[PDB]
Amino acid sequence: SKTTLAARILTKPRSMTVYEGESARFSCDTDGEPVPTVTWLRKGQVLSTSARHQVTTTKYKSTFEISSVQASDEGNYSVVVENSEGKQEAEFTLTIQK
Structure with a gap:
């Protein structure tokens, strides 16, 4: 990640489903x-x-x-991780029912 790499997704974040902002934590490891x-x-x-x-x-x-979601954040959300010359992402969906 400092000589000839680009932007890719190593361990993207997963998805989730709750009533609002209960405890849907995510972590995507991206290098660049x-x-x-x-x-x-x-x-x-x-x-x-x-x-x-x-x-x-x-x-x-x-x-x-x-x-902290309010009541209209549906469930589809994503993350485009880009670097000095790359451009990848990780699509997932955090839904809510309130």
Whole structure:
């Protein structure tokens, strides 16, 4: 991840289903030279703490946990991890029933 790599997904995040933001935590390990980038987006306003979601990013691994959703965040959400010259993602769906 610092000489000739791109952007790929090693351990994408899984999906989940709850009533709202109970405890659906996620973690996707993505590499990228020199450092990869994560972006959770699908339709609920690029996920990333847009109003009721809580995402975070580390060195080469991001993590998304929903615990503040309101009542209209459906279930499909994704994460396009891109780097200095790559562009992959991880599609999953965190649904809610409230």
